[PDB]
Design a protein around this ligand. Structure first.
Ligand code: HEC
Ligand code: HEC
Ligand code: HEC
Ligand code: HEC
Length: 107
């Protein structure tokens, strides 16, 4: 299989870039992020032309790339969404997991 990609996978599709890692979400199910679409599962980029490319930000619906990265009220687990569940009420983590500034995502 293609397995997980290398590390240092960052995405600069917005004025605020982010750096993701697969060696960190190893315990996380691939289907947890790479939600199934059409019933098929594949390893593609969220910001794929035709997937999450709304560049609206202020939309929060689905196409909102910046919505599937923060918005928690989504049909699927969101970055911050899951993070919120992970960090929960542990403090510090929610500042480096769901933190707006000075976090693991945004620095
Ligand atoms: C606190 C609730 C947060 C605020 C406010 C913002 N973020 Fe994030 N963020 C993350 C990713 C993966 C991206 C996309 C990277 C890319 O492709 O460019 C973003 C993007 C943004 C943006 C850009 C939208 C714009 O054009 O203004 C803004 C304004 C923004 N974020 C604000 C990832 C994460 C993340 C990882 C779990 C966290 C905790 C946050 N973002 C939290 C906030
Ligand atoms: C969220 C916690 C994720 C989990 C769990 C896994 N992946 Fe992932 N992967 C994620 C993102 C956000 C991205 C793209 C970054 C973006 O800007 O959206 C990726 C990318 C990949 C890719 C690259 C796409 C390609 O060109 O093929 C591959 C191959 C990939 N991911 C594989 C993969 C595997 C094998 C996973 C389980 C072992 C897995 N991912 C989990 C987010 C997340
Ligand atoms: C195209 C093949 C996609 C890729 C690659 C990813 N997503 Fe996606 N996602 C896609 C669609 C078409 C939809 C909505 C269904 C529709 O037709 O409208 C979604 C939805 C989400 C959601 C839910 C948002 C909500 O319900 O509020 C989330 C949280 C989400 N997607 C996240 C996400 C992540 C993290 C991805 C990379 C790991 C990713 N998506 C890739 C289409 C596609
Ligand atoms: C649960 C389904 C998750 C989803 C969806 C996303 N992440 Fe995550 N993340 C998760 C856990 C359990 C942890 C461990 C906490 C730790 O910091 O060790 C993390 C951690 C991160 C980190 C920090 C660690 C690192 O790898 O540098 C970052 C920067 C991070 N996560 C980013 C991230 C992004 C951008 C996501 C959406 C594309 C995302 N995570 C999804 C659990 C889950």
């Amino acid at each position: 299989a293609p397995k997980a990609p290398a590390d240092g996978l960052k995405m600069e599709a917005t004025k605020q870039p982010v750096v993701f890692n697969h060696s960190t979400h190893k315990s996380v199910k691939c289907g947890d992020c790479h939600h199934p679409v059409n019933g098929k599962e594949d390893y593609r980029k969220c910001g794929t032309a035709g997937c999450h490319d709304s560049m609206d930000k202020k939309d929060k619906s689905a196409k909102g790339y910046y919505h599937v990265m923060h918005d928690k009220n989504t049909k699927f687990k969101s970055c911050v969404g899951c993070h919120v569940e992970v960090a929960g009420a542990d403090a510090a983590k929610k500042k480096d997991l769901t933190g707006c500034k000075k976090s693991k995502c945004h620095e």
